[PDB]
């Protein structure tokens, strides 16, 4: 009851920002997630005992794969905390317990492919669920750990609570999918120019709580750039990687994927801050003024990106 997780002073400081690093030592990265729970939504919003295994079974159903790992669930949920203690009076209680839970959760057995692979291949998850394959399976793997025995971190809730924040982790968990972004991004441009835009509509809430979803995955593109670039390996690698293996399915894959087009790269990262990140961050900020500084750093690092094409590094 009174067994708070306390940080180092630096990390105490810098986790309270938006482009803070969660560092390289694995082992403390369960204990910076409760932490965050912990002061997001409070010491009593779950048993330790049973958020503690929770948290272990999360890691250990997400692999070992170069980006879509446990270091982006942990550093896609620290987003959510930066978001969510900068927009304090926003969110009711149930919010705040299901988002964290939702970013942790968000990836669960990502195996490094899109859900165009997956269709390509003709994966068994591409019958099963014909739409935002991926993400329909890490809901499902998320509701599966709940249901381990000692693993019910929402035990606690009321029945109708309970059934309200598993529906807040799927549309959180579902907007993680990328096709789905743009749609909904569009939406909330509308809205918010013809001044609609009405946070107690819960069809409007369930928008803005998709693009914080977008905006928190997309998160390593708001960091300090030496972060950035070496982030931006991780996930070329995954890409490069179904790229090989749509050859080995006798199709040339997207510039995106196909490792003979390094050089593209710097490009390609432009293309991706203005048609995704930038949009994405600017929207964001509109609806939520206190979450400029991820758009502020996005611009940052697009700016680095353009250095990197004009030679200068
Ligand atoms: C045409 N292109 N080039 C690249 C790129 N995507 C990325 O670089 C990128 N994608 C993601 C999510 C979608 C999987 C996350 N992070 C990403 N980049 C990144 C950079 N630095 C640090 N961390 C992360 C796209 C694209 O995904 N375009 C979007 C679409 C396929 C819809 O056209
Ligand atoms: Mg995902
Ligand atoms: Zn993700």
């Given at each position: 009851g009174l067994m708070q997780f306390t940080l180092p002073v630096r990390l105490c400081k810098e986790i309270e920002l938006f482009h803070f690093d969660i560092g390289p030592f694995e082992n403390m990265w369960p204990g910076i997630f409760v932490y965050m729970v912990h002061r997001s939504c409070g010491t009593s919003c779950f048993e330790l005992e049973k958020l503690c295994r929770f948290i272990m079974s999360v890691k250990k159903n997400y692999?070992?794969?170069?980006?879509?790992n446990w270091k982006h669930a942990v550093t896609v949920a620290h987003c959510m905390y930066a978001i969510l203690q900068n927009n304090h009076?926003?969110?009711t209680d149930l919010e705040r317990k299901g988002l964290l839970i939702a970013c942790l959760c968000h990836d669960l057995d990502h195996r490094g492919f899109s859900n165009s692979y997956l269709q390509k291949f003709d994966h068994p998850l591409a019958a099963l669920y014909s739409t935002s394959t991926m993400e329909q399976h890490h809901f499902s793997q998320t509701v599966s750990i709940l249901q381990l025995?000692?693993?019910?971190?929402?035990?606690?809730?009321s029945s109708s609570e309970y059934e309200q924040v598993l529906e807040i982790i799927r549309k959180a968990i579902i907007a993680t999918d990328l096709a789905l972004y743009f749609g909904n991004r569009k939406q909330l441009e509308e809205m918010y120019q013809t001044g609609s835009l009405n946070l107690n509509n819960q069809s409007h809430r369930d928008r803005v709580i998709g693009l914080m979803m977008t905006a928190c995955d997309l998160c390593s593109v708001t960091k300090l750039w030496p972060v950035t670039k070496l982030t931006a390996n991780d996930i070329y690698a995954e890409f490069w990687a179904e790229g090989d293996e749509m050859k080995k399915l006798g199709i040339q894959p997207i510039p995106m994927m196909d490792r003979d087009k390094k050089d593209e790269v710097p490009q390609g990262q432009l293309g991706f801050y203005n048609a995704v990140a930038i949009p994405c961050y600017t929207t964001l900020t509109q609806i939520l003024?206190?979450?400029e500084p991820l758009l502020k750093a996005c611009r940052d690092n697009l700016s680095q990106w353009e250095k990197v094409i004009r030679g200068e590094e």
């Open positions: 692999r070992r794969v170069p980006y879509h009076t926003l969110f025995e000692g693993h019910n971190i929402f035990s606690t809730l003024p206190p979450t």
